[PDB]
Write a protein that binds this ligand. Structure first.
Ligand SMILES: N[C@@H](CCC(=O)O)C(=O)O
Ligand SMILES: N[C@@H](CCC(=O)O)C(=O)O
Lengths: 263, 263
């Protein structure tokens, strides 16, 4: 077939994809900036394709409903043919690998705890052993599924609390979770990936921090629908970019070089 | 085809695969113990195959000669049909992915510096800026190739020194590198993966340590020849084991639970 513009699905999640300050006066890919915007340009160059960035319609990463077996989020967009590739902080997981393909990781990470400074919590075990401080995760993502599935004693205890907590402890976006931490006087802690936690630590008003070790070790990958003609070349491109130090340069650029909480 | 015993290639590298104390009175897979021996048993169970562990004939991880284009080590055993799968601390890299397939990572790691305690070095930049302390890497592995290929200023400077150093700074096995660190009075430092560095820190006589941050971020994967009927199921198995916490349990078991340098 003739070369065709590749539809990239991605998600508005800082600092992966953000609206440029002057985005109103801009069009197409130029509306956006961030780690994954930089990454997409590199991947496309190396794989020889043109592309259009599109923000996922429902603003979700992607989960499958247990009853209907229907997928949402970026995973759904790939599964149902609405996008050709996902270039986003999308976690490589078993249930996703059953339906789509992933490159080798472009970033390594694990689940972690965000607190408002001063909150007397230093571990997941700490959270599990008390009830004064509420805690939750993002909806329709891999962190929620981690807790739902885990048989580890501490993590299952946390799930049991989170699933039946009222008012709901789950949030629709990472930014909503961060806002909740900031305004809840230390009575809400947020479970999120170390990458996002470390970024938010670097942002004003510098009132949050990561505590504890990571709960797991996993990775983000570039995802393609099964049968895509792009998967092999994308995988090799990710590995090249990692080996040439480009991925590390992009992390430093978006996380630390312009961190707002000092040197 | 009828089910057939799967030939697993692996490498004698502590604590991944080690000879059991009483190995002389034992046969087959029972001769060996370690992280990758435990991992192989889990992978085989989940994928429904029987298997034979075999130690790589030439004792190497695997590199390709630039002139002949011939592969050695475990990669060679897969490429030439001498083994069906590699279950070992084998780094996922571009040149390897061009010829064999890898599961998603079962362990995350990066290149790091091992010193004898007291050596006045705290970073790769430190090594690069002096000449009193020699330093090197393992032959025929991914760390050597990292330095050979890197255009990062510090790393290229290190390569330039290492490639022409006399007497040779390269070693045939990790154990040889560790021994060299221990007996060289602080005048040899060793570049090796953080996983192996962290293990050796935990072993008597407790005279080495890791210094500096990791130089990169990468992963070990289970490797299969292209065209193998095992690749998909192995990949899904690795992800399941990671998500169920089994991989982390195995790391703790072999690295820390019986560390010899205290709590
Ligand atoms: N990276 C996650 C979203 C963030 C989270 O779940 O913490 C995913 O791919 O679902
Ligand atoms: N894991 C490496 C061997 C160790 C090293 O090169 O430091 C490889 O797969 O080649």
């Amino acid at each position: 077939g003739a070369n065709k513009t590749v539809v990239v699905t991605t998600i508005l999640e800082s600092p992966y994809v953000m609206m440029k300050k002057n985005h109103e006066m801009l069009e197409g890919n130029e509306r956006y900036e961030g780690y994954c915007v930089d990454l997409a340009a590199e991947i496309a160059k190396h794989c020889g394709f043109k592309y259009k960035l599109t923000i996922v319609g429902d603003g979700k990463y992607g989960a499958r409903d247990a009853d209907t077996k229907i997928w949402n989020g970026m995973v759904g967009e790939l599964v149902y043919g609405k996008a050709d590739i996902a270039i986003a902080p999308l976690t490589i997981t078993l249930v996703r690998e059953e339906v789509i393909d992933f490159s080798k990781p472009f970033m390594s990470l694990g689940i972690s705890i965000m607190i408002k400074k001063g909150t007397p919590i230093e571990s997941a075990e700490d959270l599990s052993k008390q009830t004064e401080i509420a805690y939750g995760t993002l909806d329709s993502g891999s962190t929620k599924e981690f807790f739902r599935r885990s048989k580890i004693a501490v993590f299952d205890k946390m799930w049991t609390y989170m699933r039946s907590a009222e008012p709901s402890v789950f949030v629709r976006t990472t930014a909503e979770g961060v806002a909740r931490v900031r305004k809840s006087k230390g009575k809400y802690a947020y479970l999120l990936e170390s990458t996002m936690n470390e970024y938010i630590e670097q942002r004003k008003p510098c009132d949050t921090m990561k505590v504890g070790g990571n709960l797991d070790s996993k990775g983000y990958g570039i995802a393609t629908p099964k049968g895509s003609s792009l998967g092999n070349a994308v995988n090799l491109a990710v590995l090249k970019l990692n080996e040439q130090g480009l991925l590390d340069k992009l992390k430093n650029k978006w996380w630390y070089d312009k961190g707002e909480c000092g040197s």
